[PDB]
Amino acid sequence: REDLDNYLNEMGEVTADNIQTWLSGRILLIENAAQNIAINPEPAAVASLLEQKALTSTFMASYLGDATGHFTIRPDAKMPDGFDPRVRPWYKGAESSSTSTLTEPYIDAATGQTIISIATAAKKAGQSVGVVGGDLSLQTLINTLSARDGMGYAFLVSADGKILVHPDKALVMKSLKEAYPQDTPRISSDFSERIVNFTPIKGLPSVNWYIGLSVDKDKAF
Ligand code: PRO
Ligand SMILES: [Cl-]
Ligand SMILES: [Cl-]
């Protein structure tokens, strides 16, 4: 048991570091996008920035919304009638953060897919000029986790217990209790009766997220 605990802990730390280092490169691209837009926030300049291959190859789309409701998105897309960027979770979350942020999964207004967004406020010498966001699909996050490793699966859960990414998509945005009503695992401890442990992801901006490692117990050696 000491041996399995030591290994799950070590695997959790590995998986956690790597997803942190997958995310933080993508967080830099958005921050750089926001910084460059703050240079020249004319919508022509904005649109040429978002059309660049480093962004379009990395994200489903990236975009700028501002306090008047103006919205520029690339690749371009017809947004639903009455779409307002200011009421979307990426906008509200970047507004209330002095750093960049990452949203919990939500329903993309463009694709209708489930997505998360990296967003940060774009600031021109103290003044906000809007919020820049980039979108990653839930399926992308599942694939990025399931690529990161021996015995069970990794999933991602917020500190408050909300399951964010899980290879069982039915469990996405269920709380731990709602997903696991009989004997609920607790983040508060780092082992739970499958055996499950939680490893904090360090160094993300604005969020407190955990890697959960879930392994078939008796198969584990
Ligand atoms: O759904 C949203 O709010 C973001 C912005 C447009 C595309 N995805
Ligand atoms: Cl990559
Ligand atoms: Cl446009």
**CA-to-CA dists, residue 98 to 27, 88, 101, 148, 218, angstroms:** 14, 18, 9, 30, 46
**CA-to-CA dists, residue 116 to 2, 6, 81, angstroms:** 36, 32, 22
Residue nearest to atom 3 of ligand 1 (CA): 88
Ligand 1 lined by 73 (C-beta under 6 Å): yes
Contact call for residues 1 and 103 (beta carbons, < 8 A) = no
User: What's the gap between Cα 128 and its chain centre?
Assistant: 23
Distance 149 CA to ligand 3 centre (A): 41
User: Which domain, by its residues, includes 60?
Assistant: 23-139
CATH number at residue 27: 3.30.450.20
Distance 72 CA to ligand 3 centre (A): 5
Distance separating alpha carbons of residues 202 and 200, to the nearest angstrom: 6
Technique behind this structure?
Answer: X-ray
Hey, what's the torsion of the CAs at 108, 100, 85, 42, to 10 degrees? -120
Name the nearest CA neighbour of 16 among 137, 164, 156.
156
Q: Which tokens belong to 39?
A: 């240079």
**CA-to-CA dists, residue 192 to 24, 51, 137, 169, 195, angstroms:** 29, 46, 29, 21, 6
**CA-to-CA dists, residue 32 to 39, 91, 155, 198, angstroms:** 11, 17, 29, 32
Query: How many CB atoms within 10 Å of residue 1?
Result: 7
